[PDB]
Amino acid sequence: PTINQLVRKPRQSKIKKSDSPALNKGFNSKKKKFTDLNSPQKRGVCTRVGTMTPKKPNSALRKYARVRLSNNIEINAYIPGIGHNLQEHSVVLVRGGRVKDLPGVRYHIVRGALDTSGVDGRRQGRSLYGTKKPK
Amino acid sequence: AVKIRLTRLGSKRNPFYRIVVADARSPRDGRIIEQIGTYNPTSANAPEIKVDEALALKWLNDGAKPTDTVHNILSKEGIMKKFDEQK
Amino acid sequence: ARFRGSNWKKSRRLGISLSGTGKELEKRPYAPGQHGPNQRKKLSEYGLQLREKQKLRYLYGMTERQFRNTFDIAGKKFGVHGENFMILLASRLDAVVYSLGLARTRRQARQLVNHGHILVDGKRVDIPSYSVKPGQTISVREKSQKLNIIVESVEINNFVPEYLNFDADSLTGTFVRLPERSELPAEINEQLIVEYYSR
Amino acid sequence: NDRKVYVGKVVSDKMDKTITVLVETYKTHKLYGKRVKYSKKYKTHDENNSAKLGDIVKIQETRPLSATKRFRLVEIVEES
RNA sequence: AUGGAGAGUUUGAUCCUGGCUCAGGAUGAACGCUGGCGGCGUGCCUAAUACAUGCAAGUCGAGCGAACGGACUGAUGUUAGCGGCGGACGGGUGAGUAACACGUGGAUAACCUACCUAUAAGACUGGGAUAACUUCGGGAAACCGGAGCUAAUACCGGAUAAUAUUUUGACGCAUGGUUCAAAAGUGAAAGACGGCUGUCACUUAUAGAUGGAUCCGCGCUGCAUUAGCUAGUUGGUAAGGUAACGGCUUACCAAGGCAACGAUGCAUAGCCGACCUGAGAGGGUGAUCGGCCACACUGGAACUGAGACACGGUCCAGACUCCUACGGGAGGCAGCAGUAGGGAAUCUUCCGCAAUGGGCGAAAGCCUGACGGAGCAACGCCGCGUGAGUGAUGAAGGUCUUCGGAUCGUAAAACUCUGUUAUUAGGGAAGAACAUAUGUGUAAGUAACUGUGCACAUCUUGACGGUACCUAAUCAGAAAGCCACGGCUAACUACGUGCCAGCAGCCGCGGUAAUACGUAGGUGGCAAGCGUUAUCCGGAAUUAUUGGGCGUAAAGCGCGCGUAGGCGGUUUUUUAAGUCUGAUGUGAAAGCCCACGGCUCAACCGUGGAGGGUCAUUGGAAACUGGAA
């Protein structure tokens, strides 16, 4: 562009879509419209608990759950680790981060924190998974 | 009115003071009109006063009045005496 | 101490003595552990640039952040940058209580300064990283001059550098003049550190 | 103390006692450093209305004097 | 000079283009697992949601009366009241606000200011009332209604009095100015002293200091799939009234003003010093601290005052909450603690006015949820530790094995040594400097004195806090975990499982011989922390001013005529807007940076510089760009 062209119309940059977009919203219950927060975790309550099958080459039966959050948006969230204990109407803390195989799953359920428990016999990165130190 | 007073600096348990021409309505630590001096009640032998002695006489001559321990300070300088004198 | 681990295994892995020399790397002069005795492969750029941070820092017992928080004071001065780093660490206080011979090892000349025996300039100082400077006076406390490990350490020392004096009776140093690179630990390529911290 | 003055050019005359000047100025442009030219119409006040449309004149500033006028005519300088 | 690194991932292989991902620094963070100590900080970012309970503003009997109450006439009170002053400060919060809000440079011959300080002139003479009090009544509170009284530095009538308003004469536009000489009007206080005067109340005139108000220049969010906006609107003319200019109004008139340099609309937002990131250019942000602004259940308003249209004032309208003998009464934490709700998420219903500051009072004193401390929380920074020395890199154990061995490993026993801390057992700082009183001088004023101001040296007292801190004694005891180990990117093996269970930032791994899954040895990185997630900047030259392109990878409009706008041959003279060089005034402090001092070091604190502007004013130069001839 010549310098007159960049003075009439100037250069504009591009915008950042997030990942994780349902963590950037909160709900004002009384005025009754959404609000913006940028929180790192949100609390939810689970409305299903099942398993999906992965994609292109992979293969397994992968445990996941549908959970509606504090603002009232609903999402699927992968349950990590090996065992679990979720039912209907459990209270989970959810966190960012997508699982690549599953289409359309893009949150993770923090193990350790609310109703969810740590994993049952883990010893080596035990603070993901949160389990406590044996003996 | 317009006063001549001390602000407080330093950190906890360890104060330093600047000697200030403010206004009486102001908060201790905010808006001022001039700075005049310095004072350090805690250092070793006696406190270190230090105070420009010809701005302070400008302001005693205009009104300001000193608070009660800036009257023990402009005293050791005999500033409160050359002010007395020019009758 | 802070590290207070095991100094022969760190001496075999990096390749310098780190002590009274030689003795560490004798029978087994290779790295430690199960794949120990079997051929070393090659180290990368990062591989090698990091072996020099870690050489100069396990010598002087510092940790990171204290090591790195010093690295750029050193690089505030005028001069060449990566030799004031070498100098300013020579001038630490447990590092001067070692170059004088007041103790026989570096982990012990820090429990002197720490436990409160040393008294630079007449006043007790117990901060291993105090940063003494040209003209000060390292001495010894007075109820602590017939500690065994002090008289035993001072005889056999045999050496004192040239920016230090040492009045071997009285137990009393000086720290005369700053050092210069010709005298500081010598298996240490100092631009393998300045280029590590510009990554 | 003294009160700022300008030089101008009259771009209207329809009001009564009241002419509108255009003063021309210039700003560089903080990012690509070329200058630009712009303008801004100062409403000024003349009494026994003299100056005419299109006409380099000169104006000084004063106390507020109607809703929008704040300057007054000083001296014509030339016309056609 | 002090400053600038990349790597993986499209092919059978290659060179490009182009996305994607990682490695760095940040944060009022949260979350998971672990946690020894000290110092400096920080800590509801969400519903400006609702608030239970205690406190955040009082003070003066040297203005005054009291049925006052009472030492002893009643000291002292002020239980109560009238009067005076402060309550507009300080404390909180950003809902609203795209605005002269804010920042920066100017003007106001268009302005206001209690007190403080000076300099003069004064304070004259009278009056009428009234609180409290008392006595009758009512009213569920809340309170009210009569009388009968009584003070005040309360209120008022005149006396006199400027530069007060008028009418005369002797520049920056509407002028300003001071010399008049007439006229109209306009003041006041006593209190507590000493022998008439000192103190501190009043009143008027001027100034100064201080705190405001107004106007302008310039900067300062996006959105045309938002192109027309206004009607006191835009000028004029009078009249009001404002502290002050003005459509600021009200009439009477005219038909204007504004806008693609973006009128209007719409969405969003306090602003700034500053902060974070980047070699920089730039980008992101406006916690804690200061300056400004706005707001106090919500919307209207006025009183009192120098100053408010008023967080702990008033009245009205609305919604809420409580009480009641149903007629009516009361309220309002975006003060400080604290409660409920909501959220991933955020502290004691804490002590003292000791210091520093304010309010009132002659002072003593009093009031202060300002402030000073102390509690809570690894929430951050910074320092010290959890030993050190020698000692077989062999015991016996784990793990591997090529079964010989190898490794953990100087690691451990083992002997010594020390006390940071830890414990007990004794001492024990500064932060303070007074005010006030008491003397003694001195100076002014005095008939003289009291007093006043100054100078001195005396007397007092620290919440924290017996908190630092010191000195002994005692003992290595009581103080490390968390994440890796395929490649990027330091650190590998064994076994279990067998596209299962799982893992995954990206590439991808797992289908009975995975350094990728789990666990166990060994390694490596960091450390009272270490991982994970959210967000910002860099890498990214991936908006390119630095510093990019359009034949074929994304990209020259099918082509003309042309309007703004941008840009333009040669020479001379002049001008000086841009340009260059000075001098000043400013761009607060705190920052940032540099120097230095004080902290045992360091964080931290304190001083002096330096830097920082499309800045203003005033001089000079004249090549270039511009203006003229």
Is A55 in contact with A103 (CB distance < 8 Å)? yes
Is B44 in contact with B21 (CB distance < 8 Å)? no
The number of C-alpha atoms within 13 Å of D64 and in the hemisphere containing its C-beta is 2
For C83, residues 6+ apart whose C-beta sits below 8 A from its C-beta are: C181, C190
Residue B52, CB, strand E, below 7 Å: no
Residue B24: which of B5, B8, B40, B43 has the closest Cα? B5
Is A41 in contact with A69 (CB distance < 8 Å)? no
Q: Which two tokens stand for residue B16?
A: 């330093």
Q: Which residue of A has its CA nearest to D36?
A: A7
Q: Which residue of D has its CA nearest to A5?
A: D32
Residue B31, CB, strand E, below 7 Å: yes
**Nearest-angstrom CA–CA distance, C106 and A123:** 37
**Nearest-angstrom CA–CA distance, C77 and C133:** 15
* Angle (nearest 5°) at CA D31 between D28 and D32: 70
**Nearest-angstrom CA–CA distance, C10 and C17:** 9
Is A133 in contact with A126 (CB distance < 8 Å)? yes
**Nearest-angstrom CA–CA distance, A43 and A64:** 16
Q: Which residue of A has its CA nearest to D33?
A: A3
* Cα A94 to the center of its chain, rounded Å: 5
Give me the residues paired with residue C175 across strands.
Answer: none
**Counted domains in chain B:** 1
| D with A: touching (≥3 Cβ pairs within 8 Å) | yes
**Nearest-angstrom CA–CA distance, A40 and A23:** 7
Q: What sign has the CA pseudo-torsion C98, C99, C100, C105?
A: positive
How many residues are present in chain C?
Answer: 199
Resolution (Å units): 2.9
- Which nucleotides on strand E sit less than 7 A from a protein beta carbon? 2, 4-5, 23-24, 29-34, 40-41, 45-47, 49, 89-91, 106-110, 114-117, 172-174, 208-211, 214-220, 223, 232-237, 245-248, 254-259, 261, 282, 289-292, 342-345, 355-359, 370-374, 382-390, 393, 399-400, 406-411, 416-420, 430-435, 443-444, 453-456, 470-472, 476, 481-484, 488-493, 499-511, 518-528, 530-537, 543-545, 548-549, 565-567, 577-578, 588, 594-595, 600-602, 604-607, 614, 617
Which nucleotide is closest, CA of B25 to its C1'? Answer: E89
| Beta strand spans in B1-87 (E) | 3-6, 17-21, 34-39, 50-51, 65-66
Contact A6 D36 (CB under 8 A): no
What's the one-letter identity of residue A25? K
Q: What angle in degrees, to the nearest 10, is found between the helix axes of C66-74 and C81-88?
A: 130
Contacting A residues, span 74-133, partner chain D, CB-CB under 8 Å: none
Task: Tell me which chains share at least 3 CB pairs under 8 Å with chain A.
Answer: D
* Angle (nearest 5°) at CA D50 between D48 and D53: 135
Phi, psi of C13 (to 5 degrees): -80, -50
Residue D63, CB, strand E, below 7 Å: yes
Residue D43, CB, strand E, below 7 Å: yes
> Which CATH class for the C89-175 domain?
alpha beta
Q: A13: distance to nearest CA of chain D, Å?
A: 15
Residue C133: which of C93, C188, C170 has the closest Cα? C93
- Set of chain D residues whose Cβ sits within 8 Å of the Cβ of A3: 32, 34
Is C115 in contact with C127 (CB distance < 8 Å)? no
Q: How far is the CA of A95 from the C1' of E524 (A)?
A: 30
Give me the residues paired with residue B21 across strands.
Answer: B4, B34
